[PDB]
Design an enzyme around this catalytic site. Structure first.
Site, PDB file in Angstrom:
ATOM      1  N   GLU A   1     -18.067 -50.517 -31.509  1.00  0.00           N
ATOM      2  CA  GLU A   1     -17.083 -49.490 -31.158  1.00  0.00           C
ATOM      3  C   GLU A   1     -16.806 -49.584 -29.675  1.00  0.00           C
ATOM      4  O   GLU A   1     -17.691 -49.921 -28.879  1.00  0.00           O
ATOM      5  CB  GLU A   1     -17.616 -48.119 -31.508  1.00  0.00           C
ATOM      6  CG  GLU A   1     -16.675 -46.974 -31.323  1.00  0.00           C
ATOM      7  CD  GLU A   1     -15.416 -47.101 -32.186  1.00  0.00           C
ATOM      8  OE1 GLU A   1     -15.456 -46.739 -33.386  1.00  0.00           O
ATOM      9  OE2 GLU A   1     -14.420 -47.649 -31.655  1.00  0.00           O
TER      10      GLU A   1
ATOM     11  N   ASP B   1     -19.769 -49.570 -36.289  1.00  0.00           N
ATOM     12  CA  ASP B   1     -20.042 -49.138 -34.927  1.00  0.00           C
ATOM     13  C   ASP B   1     -21.069 -49.917 -34.133  1.00  0.00           C
ATOM     14  O   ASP B   1     -20.893 -50.113 -32.928  1.00  0.00           O
ATOM     15  CB  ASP B   1     -20.332 -47.658 -34.919  1.00  0.00           C
ATOM     16  CG  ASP B   1     -19.176 -46.858 -35.352  1.00  0.00           C
ATOM     17  OD1 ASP B   1     -18.056 -47.162 -34.845  1.00  0.00           O
ATOM     18  OD2 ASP B   1     -19.354 -45.923 -36.174  1.00  0.00           O
TER      19      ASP B   1
ATOM     20  N   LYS C   1     -17.097 -41.592 -45.822  1.00  0.00           N
ATOM     21  CA  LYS C   1     -17.419 -42.829 -45.154  1.00  0.00           C
ATOM     22  C   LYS C   1     -17.856 -43.879 -46.173  1.00  0.00           C
ATOM     23  O   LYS C   1     -17.452 -45.043 -46.100  1.00  0.00           O
ATOM     24  CB  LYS C   1     -18.552 -42.569 -44.163  1.00  0.00           C
ATOM     25  CG  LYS C   1     -18.320 -43.101 -42.792  1.00  0.00           C
ATOM     26  CD  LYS C   1     -17.152 -42.459 -42.090  1.00  0.00           C
ATOM     27  CE  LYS C   1     -17.361 -42.486 -40.589  1.00  0.00           C
ATOM     28  NZ  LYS C   1     -16.134 -42.867 -39.878  1.00  0.00           N
TER      29      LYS C   1
END
Ligand SMILES: O=c1[nH]c2cc(-c3ccc(F)cc3)ccc2cc1O
Ligand SMILES: [Mn+2]
Ligand SMILES: [Mn+2]
Length: 200
Positions: free
Chosen positions: A85, A113, A139
């Site tokens: 990220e 991430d 998610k």
């Protein structure tokens, strides 16, 4: 009391590096941080959580997991996490491909991430103003067939993670939770919170 500006809050309470990475992320996807301000704050918050998740964690000279909070990370130590990220698309996929081609782990369909070199898996970090179980499910629905580990934090201290595997020690997770609580308290003092909660 008086209503503050969410832009003022972001620039005051987040590190400039974080703000900059978030501004760049928003431009990359065609969204304006001066307009989508609650989103800007959410992006900064999530980035900061990603950084805080990886902070201080190394794999030692005998190659196992340790925490060093000194500002002197002796040079034979390997950072435990790769941060995905915050990178632009090209660089983010460059890093992901490199990891996959190297470690042998399967290539994810969407950018995660972090990568955890100790547990040998990608991690998706969630930060939510809603119930953690609801956001966990969402998610998971995008990740589907999943070698990607999910870890969700809320602003009220709740967490949910894949297979009840929380990856980090309690103290590390407590730092993240304390920071989220502080963000919420500060937004609240500026009367920014109600609006920010409702806009997720
Ligand atoms: O890993 C995450 N990444 C996110 C990225 C965004 C985002 C949305 C719009 C942008 F212009 C830039 C970033 C918004 C929300 C998220 C939530 C995540 O968990
Ligand atoms: Mn992400
Ligand atoms: Mn995430």
């Amino acid at each position: 009391g008086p209503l503050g500006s969410m832009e003022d809050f972001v620039r005051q309470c987040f590190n400039p590096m974080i703000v900059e990475l978030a501004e760049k992320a928003m431009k990359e996807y065609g969204e304006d941080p001066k307009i989508e301000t609650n989103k800007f704050a959410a992006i900064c918050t999530h980035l900061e959580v990603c950084f805080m998740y990886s902070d201080f964690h190394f794999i030692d000279e005998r190659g196992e997991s340790i925490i060093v909070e000194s500002g002197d990370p002796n040079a034979l130590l390997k950072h435990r996490f790769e941060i995905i990220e915050g990178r632009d698309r090209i660089m983010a996929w460059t890093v992901v491909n490199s990891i996959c081609n190297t470690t042998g782990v399967e290539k994810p369909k969407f950018l995660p991430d972090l990568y955890d070199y100790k547990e040998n898996r990608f991690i998706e970090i969630g930060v939510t103003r809603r119930e953690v179980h609801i956001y966990y499910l969402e998610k998971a629905n995008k990740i589907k067939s999943e070698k990607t580990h999910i870890h969700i934090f809320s602003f009220t201290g709740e967490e949910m993670a894949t297979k009840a595997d929380y990856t980090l020690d309690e103290e590390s997770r407590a730092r993240i939770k304390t920071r989220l609580f502080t963000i919420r308290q500060e937004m609240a003092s500026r009367s920014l919170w109600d609006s920010f909660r409702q806009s997720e």
